[PDB]
Amino acid sequence: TRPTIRPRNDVVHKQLSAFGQYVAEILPKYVQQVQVSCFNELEIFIHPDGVIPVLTFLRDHTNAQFKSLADLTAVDVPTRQNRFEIVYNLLSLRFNSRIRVKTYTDELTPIESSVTVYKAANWYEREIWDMFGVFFANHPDLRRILTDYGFEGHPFRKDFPLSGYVELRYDDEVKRVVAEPVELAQEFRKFDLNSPWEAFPAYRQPPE
Amino acid sequence: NLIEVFVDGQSVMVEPGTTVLQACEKVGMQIPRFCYHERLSVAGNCRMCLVEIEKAPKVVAACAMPVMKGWNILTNSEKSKKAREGVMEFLLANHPLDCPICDQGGECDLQDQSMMFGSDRSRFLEGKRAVEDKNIGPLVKTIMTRCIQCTRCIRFASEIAGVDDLGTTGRGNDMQVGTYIEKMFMSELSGNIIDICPVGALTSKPYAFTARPWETRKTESIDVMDAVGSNIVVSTRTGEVMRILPRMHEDINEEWISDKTRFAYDGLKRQRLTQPMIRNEKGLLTYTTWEDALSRVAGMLQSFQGNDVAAIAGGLVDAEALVALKDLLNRVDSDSLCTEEVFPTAGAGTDLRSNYLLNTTIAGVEEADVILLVGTNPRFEAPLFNARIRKSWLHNDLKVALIGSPVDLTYRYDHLGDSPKILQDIASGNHPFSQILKEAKKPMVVLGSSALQRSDGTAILAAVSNIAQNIRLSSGVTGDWKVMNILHRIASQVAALDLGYKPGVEAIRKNPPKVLFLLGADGGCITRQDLPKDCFIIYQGHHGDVGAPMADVILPGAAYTEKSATYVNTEGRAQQTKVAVTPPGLAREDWKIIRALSEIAGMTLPYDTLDQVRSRLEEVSPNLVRYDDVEGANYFQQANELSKLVNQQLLADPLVPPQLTIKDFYMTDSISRASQTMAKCVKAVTEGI
Amino acid sequence: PTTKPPTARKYIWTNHKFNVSGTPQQYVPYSTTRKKIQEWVPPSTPYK
Amino acid sequence: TSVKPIFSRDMNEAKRRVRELYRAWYREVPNTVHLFQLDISVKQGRDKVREMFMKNAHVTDPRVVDLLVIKGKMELEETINVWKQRTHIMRFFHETEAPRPTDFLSKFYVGHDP
Amino acid sequence: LGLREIRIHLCQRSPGSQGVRDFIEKRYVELKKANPDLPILIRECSDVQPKLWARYAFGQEKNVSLNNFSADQVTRTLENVLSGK
Amino acid sequence: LIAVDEKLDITTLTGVPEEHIKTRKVRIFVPARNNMQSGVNNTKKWKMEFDTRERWENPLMGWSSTADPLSNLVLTFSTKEDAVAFAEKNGWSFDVEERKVPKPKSKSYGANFSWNKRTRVSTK
Amino acid sequence: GVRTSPTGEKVTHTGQAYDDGDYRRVRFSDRQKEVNENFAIDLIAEQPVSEVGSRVISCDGGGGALGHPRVYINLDKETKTGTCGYCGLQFRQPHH
């Protein structure tokens, strides 16, 4: 029975693989790669300029009715040339399925806004811009959403310090809240927790 | 040629004699281990490295089994996993539940390998074994209930340290590791048994209970206690130095550090200089401000000039500080710059680096065939150099000959008298060792710099250079092998000689100065007895040992753990110490202090940042900014020709090294003298028990 | 507690104290660790 | 290597956009001073706008200039719509920050800063 | 006017330092013997041109490029510094 | 698609203060293996960390205070070239340390029982 | 076993006591200093020594799962008492 191990769904794995081949054949111009995770989650890696065609197909196609945009976020990987990774999660209610579309960009490369396909993309792209600095070209209203007014820098980048650079306090001389360089009574204590022994041999990388 | 083996179906070419563990290391797989250490011999008793061969029905010890042609190694097979689980089950079945009160804590190999390869449950329903704890000195704390009988300390003791006082007594489950008598394992390489013990059986006593591995921040710096230039890691916690650990460098350090390096970090917390000090109307030292102290020093510097200005550099000074002080003293046309260590200036002197450097690198000792030590005690002057010599001796039948005092090295050597008359005899060719050197393919002559401190250091240098020249003439002239070698015992000596400081204080003795800058000079070579009356002394340093008591103005500076600095070891390699903590109190960086003093005096130095100071260092000597490089030109012919022209007479005194015992090793410099752990070690080795 | 009295220990407070904030008996924080660095003490005797 | 442009193609159109943004900011300072009841002068506000523009005068990449003018337009529309308060407008001036010493001797006296 | 020290920086492998290396090999010993009290420090460069720094009194230093110089040219340049012309 | 003959420089866009842009030197290096353990899984990725700044003792409770925002910031890169490119485009100074890998070693169990060599062990 | 410093300030079990010239004693003016009167070292010294006729004894701190992890103390060194270090409890084989 193996009660401590999650059961696997080969039927769903095969269905997702077949649909991945289907979409890859239908859109060869932009689809760069297709993967299926072992917990049955389809993933498509496309060219950054194929966002609008791929999303429009996945929304309007009869066999792919992904009418709902579940989420839209970014992942920062500084070791890559195109550090920012834009991730779209789509939900198909007609077929009761979920799909993921992943593209890449850097600081100075705009990404076409998908507000014309999904309306939630408006606030999702505003948050992505506010937190990472990724610019979306045709956005009806692109501005900060979460950070303070006049905040400098994008907090969610990996190179942004955890406590930031400035702090706020009330200064009685000027009778207003003032911003001053950060200074902590107790410094955040960094812990080195990585064990020096490899845990999962299945993910071992070549020594190169 | 290389043979082809397979690891998990992946082909890899390995040299004959390669073991399964090394083949897996080449393919990128690290087999678990407890008794196997790459620097020690192969034991094959912990049985944790058992792996399955595809067609062999029996598991093999990967650390000791050579690979055969066409062998498929199944590292992650079911049999291998079951073997690992069983071995871990036995080890943990007999192990005690001491993890929370154990200094090994979060950096234990038993814990990590249990979490990665062992089971998560215990079937042991019996009573555990308790073992009496031994006592092997004030440095290593033994809680031997945690020993897993892996025999790493025994093999290390014997092979590396040349001390055979560790072993296993009894047999069966009651086998115990110890001395069997109340004997202290006191040696210059004793903390490495603390490092290599995979469990908390051997732990550091000064570091006991203070911190945990996950809290500490690691700063990669180098060692300044001796001239080897060992690479270390400083473990700090909330801006306080907590521990010193070795850092691998196969050409210098090779995973080992000396006990003085490891356990003298607690001298940085005592007798520290934290505020500038002047003298009041009563002549007593009182705290003052940087502006006032620097104004007084600048006034004296403006009042005096010429050869009436001297500087004495100590043993823990950096290249940036040395070059800043040199420029400051050259601003006033003054030139009484000196180091508190003597090197023969006759002939080539400090002009050629291949005259005071260790030309044959430390890694080059392993390639030598015959080595001759003159007037040195490498077991205490440079413990890692002696360790490398011992390793070469053991693994290549290296013939070691020592001229002078019969110090107890950790290996058998041919003793040659105690007088430099033998040194002259070898050069002439009467001694049989001349024939041994002639027939040797790779000879080496290492002259200790402590022997150059005598009144006839120039004569000794000329004699050893003549020996090297005779070797060159008789043997092959062709080849890049370098015979002449000089071994230093002061960290800053090589950097000062490269920058252009005059070695020794003979110049200052000849011309008494009116202004004296003691830059970390705690050796006591020159005092107010030698100085003229009412001489003005500015002592810039971080510990108050001699210069601070006898100084007029005291300027607190930064320690090596507290400043970013450059140090050149005995073989000419330059390494930069990084910042671990910040100087206490009002202490500042040394070159910054010198630059501020120059600015106040009006002769402002042209550098304001570390990059600019290092550009100045590059201008004076580019080898001080080429860090990892050790290659250099050879000018032995020129040095020998310049040495031959003027010669003197050798004294009729025995060559006695300044350090003859481990207590003399323990007390060498200001940090060691301020250390409490070193005091405990001295008391233990003197009074015993 | 009349039916089931608590276990008696020698270190338990005999007199209970209420919240003493705003009173002279209030808790005041301080560091319980010694000084990390000892500074050098210059000699009390003159020189030269 | 050819890269996708945000705007302006070459540098001339980027400079044109910079000048447009500068005009928009210049014509907004009196309104900002009047609405926010700032105690500063209009000349001080114009000089601060000039200073903020000048600290990016070393940029020679058209895409970076385009992003700079985009962020400038954002922070201008925050000021026009009174989304910012007097707090942020005065944060532009650092009126409470103590003057940091800049000479080597003063930096040496105060602490261990480079 | 009063020369204090001389520093000769030559790369041990670059072609441009071939003349300077030959000067050290066959001419340095005689030069040093004539000036026993003059500090003539020979050092090593990595990829820059060879240099001849001359530290005079009161911390004034003049640098002369020795790139692609022959042994004779190095000798003439060095003897100009010692003489003062 | 425009062509730019310029070096990448996003210092004006990162929002970092000029002090922490100019006066900072990062250290690119492969972490040294901890000598207390034989594992080598923490010596495979390059790291970028900033220089240590001043830490003082809080007057109250004696805690460890700081004024350096980039004290705890450590970045992981898969390649020295990637780390150098990131540091260059962010504008900080950098010092690079070459990776140190242990040299191959010839291990032989039979050498412990040599007939005439010094490698013979006196104990097991 | 509380002890008083020469400045009139009580000394804690860790030896903490502000110096005479330390300005930080002002925080205790018109207020008090939080010092715990019970000294663990003194109490554990006041505890007696248990004698058991076995080479190896086991200590779990009392209470079973409410104590500390079980450890084994080897009572072979006749010149000292074997101390369980979780609870600082001394055991000793019956001599004489």
Ligand code: SF4
């Ligand atoms: S040696 Fe390791 S397993 Fe044993 S008590 Fe210590 S931390 Fe635990």
Ligand code: SF4
């Ligand atoms: S004390 Fe440590 S190194 Fe020695 S045999 Fe026991 S576990 Fe191994």
Ligand code: FES
């Ligand atoms: S590592 Fe091979 S048996 Fe111990």
Ligand SMILES: [Mg+2]
């Ligand atoms: Mg250990």
Ligand SMILES: [Zn+2]
């Ligand atoms: Zn107990």
